[PDB]
């Protein structure tokens, strides 16, 4: 549980801009890319069984995010928290991400940084 969790902390992600957040393949897979200096850190969550993205209603989007420039994107990382749960005998990692102005929760089978 915690090897990956402080392997994430070793990225020194705090306050980093997120450039892409994609949930694909029928919610099997989540891709989060944030910038470390000028480079791209990828977080990849595979084997997902729960994907829950909550955007703050206080932060009203006046156009589709796809037509934002990276200059207009507000999303930045505040806390990534890893955990472990078991549901009907299935053990799953959990990740809760405070990337204001949205909240993310993922129950996945693997987490890997690229």
């Amino acid at each position: 549980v915690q090897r990956i969790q402080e392997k994430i902390d070793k990225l020194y992600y705090w306050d980093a801009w997120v450039t892409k957040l994609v949930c694909d393949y029928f919610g099997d897979e989540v891709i989060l890319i944030f910038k470390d200096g000028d480079d791209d850190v990828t977080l990849q969550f595979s084997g997902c069984y729960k994907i829950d993205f909550k955007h703050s209603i206080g932060y009203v989007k006046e156009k589709s995010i796809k037509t934002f420039t990276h200059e207009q994107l507000p999303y930045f990382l505040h806390d990534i928290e890893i955990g472990e749960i078991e549901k009907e005998g299935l053990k799953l990692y959990t990740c809760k991400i405070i990337m204001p102005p949205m909240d993310l929760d993922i129950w996945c089978k693997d987490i890997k940084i690229e």
Binding site: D15, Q72, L73, P74, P101
Partner: protein, 76 residues
């Protein structure tokens, strides 16, 4: 204009700049909707309520408007 409270930062916002606050995070963006300023509560590595400052191209600035990568985490 360095030594301000958060309330006067939000009240003295420049022309055309709008802002929004939610769960203790404030995003201020200029007339181009470019994010220029963010106020944040403490996290694991910064343990104080801080200001973030950003130029026309979203680069971190220090108190002096000089572009920075520590100094980017500005008390108020």
């Amino acid at each position: 204009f360095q030594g301000m409270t958060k309330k006067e930062i939000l009240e003295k916002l420049p022309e055309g700049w709008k802002y929004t606050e939610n769960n203790g995070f404030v995003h201020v963006r200029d007339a181009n909707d470019t994010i220029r300023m963010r106020i944040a509560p403490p996290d694991k590595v910064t343990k104080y309520d801080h200001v973030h400052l950003y130029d026309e191209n979203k680069n971190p600035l220090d108190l002096n408007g000089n572009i920075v990568d520590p100094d980017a985490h500005i008390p108020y």
